[PDB]
Amino acid sequence: MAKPIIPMPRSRFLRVKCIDCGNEQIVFSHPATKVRCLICGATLVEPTGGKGIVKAKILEVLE
Amino acid sequence: GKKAPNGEFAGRKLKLKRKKFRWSDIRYKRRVLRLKEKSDPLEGAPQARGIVLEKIAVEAKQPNSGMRKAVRVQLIKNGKVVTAFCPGDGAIKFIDEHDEVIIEGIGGPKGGSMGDIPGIRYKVVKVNRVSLKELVKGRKEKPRR
Amino acid sequence: TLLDPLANALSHITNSERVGKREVYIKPASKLIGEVLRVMQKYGYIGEFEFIDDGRAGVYRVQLLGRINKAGAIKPRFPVKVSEFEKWEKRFLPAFEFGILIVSTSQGVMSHKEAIEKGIGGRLIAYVY
Amino acid sequence: MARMHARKRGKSGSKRPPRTAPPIWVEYTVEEIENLVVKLRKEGYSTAMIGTILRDQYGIPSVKLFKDPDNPNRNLTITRILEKHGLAPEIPEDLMFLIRRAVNLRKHLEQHPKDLHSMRGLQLIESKIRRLVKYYKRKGKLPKNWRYDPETAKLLVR
RNA sequence: AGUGGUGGCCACUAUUAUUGGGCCUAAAGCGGCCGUAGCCGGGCCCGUAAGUCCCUGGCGAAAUCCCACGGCUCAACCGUGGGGCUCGCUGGGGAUACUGCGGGCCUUGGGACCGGGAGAGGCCGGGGGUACCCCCGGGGUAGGGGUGAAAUCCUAUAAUCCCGGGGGGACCGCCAGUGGCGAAGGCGCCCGGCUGGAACGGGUCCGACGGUGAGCGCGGAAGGCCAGGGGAGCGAACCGGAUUAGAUACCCGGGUAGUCCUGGCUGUAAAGGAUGCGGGCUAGGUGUCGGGCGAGCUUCGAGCUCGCCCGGUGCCGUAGGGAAGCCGUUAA
RNA sequence: GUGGGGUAACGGCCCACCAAGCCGAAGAUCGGUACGGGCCGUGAGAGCGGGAGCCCGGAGAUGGACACUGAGACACGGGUCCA
Secondary structure, X not given: XXXXXXXXXXXXXXXXXXXXXXXXXXXXXXXXXXXXOOOOOOEEEEOOOOOOEEXXXXXXXXX | OOOOOXXXXXXXXXXXXXXXXXXXXXXXXXXXXXXXXXXXOOOOOOEEEEEEEEEEEEOXXXXXXXXXXXXXXXXXXXXXXXXXXXXXXXHHHOOOOOOEEEEEEOOOOOOOXXXXXXXXXXXXXXXXXXXXHHHHOOOOOOOOO | OOOOHHHHXXXXXXXXXXXXXXXXXXXXXXXXXXXXXXXXXXXXXOOOEEEEOOOOOOEEEEEOOOOOOOEEEOOOOOEEOOOOHHHHHHHHOOOOOOOOOOEEEOOEEEOOHHHHXXXXXXXXXXXXX | OOOOOOOOOOOOOOOOOOOOOOOXXXXXXXXXXXXXXXXXXXXXXOHHHHHHHHHHOOOOOOOOOOOOOOOOOOOOOOHHHHHHHOOOOOOOHHHHHHHHHHHHHHHHHHHOOXXXXXXXXXXXXXXXXXXXXXXXXXXXXXXXXXXXXXHHHHHHHO
């Protein structure tokens, strides 16, 4: 970990660009809960403990 | 710590801890009560006179040998039975029955005794108020009685 | 839990030094730590010191000279008068001329000699040698 | 961390996000994200589950670090917003859930009798609730005149 | 001009530990938890100045005590002056680091949320086989049984022996591992439902709610006690036999409560890690269980393995500690 | 609590009335022991131990009860009375 000089998780951010409707979401890298589209209600990702399993094929740009 | 009331206003807790555990010494408990006083037959006093009931002797223990000269006394001070060890060389001439004999403690109230005695805690210093110990010594007063 | 944090911060610093480590990372993090560090640093019994300001957990990084053999805090934090400063320095401590019996006074933290000069004590906070 | 109270082992090593600089990798505003919270609360989500949602969907690090402050209550995040709207009751969500479990357990012990393990757990949950409540009543999270007894618990649940 | 004895008190005695003591094994950790009184409280700010420090002034009789000088030959002693005296009380002015309180604030402690996952955790129902036993039928004679040797004992219309069948109770060899679960006592056939807890990753949530905890409350193996049921094997008592001088005992033949189940009741343990609970901190190495993560191998299933990371259980060992044996991130 | 008596005088001191409070685990109540203090003894201190001559204040005078005279006694070598 990173406990003595600034605590840091395992996480990061990535921008996902959907292909099921083209909505652009920023996603946290440890899904704990499913993510929905704001315009279709369709599933981007399904969660498995810690880092979720990425449902279908959806692009990701790693910020 | 592994123990204690170290707090600012905790101090009563600590003071009681110590107060209970202090009682675990017999010698402290005896002296504050008056159990010491009561138990010893002289009643906390240095000496007491009494009348020799009869001359008895007591047996030596297993390490040791020797048949000790002794008096069973009834204190004129109270009305209790005491066992008191009488010294003397040829001891028995010096000591005398039904005269007044004066008995003192010896060696503290440690509760222990010498090996030659089964349990005698006491000394006879004086017979008719002239010491036995003068008669043991050759340099103050040589044998009498 | 975490209570009396200062004693703990001194206690880590002693273990470091017994090993002869170069530095210390103090997880506890206060005004109390930094003023005590400044007193330590004036005497030059500690070296240079860094404070990083984090609000996740402030950290202090301390240089060790090794000149502090033992430094720990007081179990009651019982109060101390001006006449009484000497009495505590001979009694408990092996020191006699080392000049730190750290005490907190109305100004911050002071040493022994510094408490005399001002004329002010308070509650006895700790000791250092 | 580490503490022990119904386990003989330590606590999890997880920590809060240190992206304590405001977002700029999010591309949604404060405004849009509030809008989402009203709809989700109304739907049937409880305030922990909303905040989890917000992190995944809307990509914020923490909900403490994109929306503090915006109302002047301590530790400003979700349920304080809701509290001013009247979408959240005053009894913390924490306490609502604890209480719900404490009801659930009496009903099993009845039907399933001879439960030693489950019985010790009923004593243990309840006990913890009185201590939490004792602090909350004072803080104003609960009323002063409120009390936590197990009958009042059953009331809330029903 | 005393010496010596006895009795007592104080020192010696850190044998009362505040200075200045301990609790694996020397005497000493509560079987475990819970939470009350009480004790104790992270960071940042702010108000009060109660605690806490400073200064002045009222006062704590004389005598006792020290120092100084003087007087009595001298000194003890007493005078005189100075200093100090159980020294517990009083009033005003100031300071605000530290503490107490009132208010505000922050997530670092605490509790809480969500998802994959493991398990001899608990409650209920179903069910399999092995092995013992009983009884029915077949088969099959003269000893079987038991031991260190024996003996009692058991057996002739037939025991032991060997097969087939039915019934019954009880338990789960292999599986099983230095292994896993539960607060603790403790928990092992397999299947399903019901149900409690835990490690972990993501701190999503309340915002110091925290720690400890006298008392109180609660669980508590085995056996026992009470009722009812069950009873195949096992077996205190018990009744023989041997061994033994005799056996009072080890050994053998029979044998009752009990062992099993439910309802009820009582409460003990070398209930052990002989190591109270909570936190921070102090060299490492290796294995192992479960999780997270990146790979290689792949039977394409985390199947076999490596490292980082998180928790737990083990071995070796540093600083240090211990009388030593040992202990050593699971601390003594 | 309210009124009142009586005292040199406050007062459940005593009294009438009215109320049901008061006290307690930071140890009440009960049993037991003890004049208290300045000081003293001991100990480097912390502490322990002690209340003796002597000074200070209270208490007593065969045991108990009782009034009078006096600023002052319910009176230590005064009275009444009971044991």
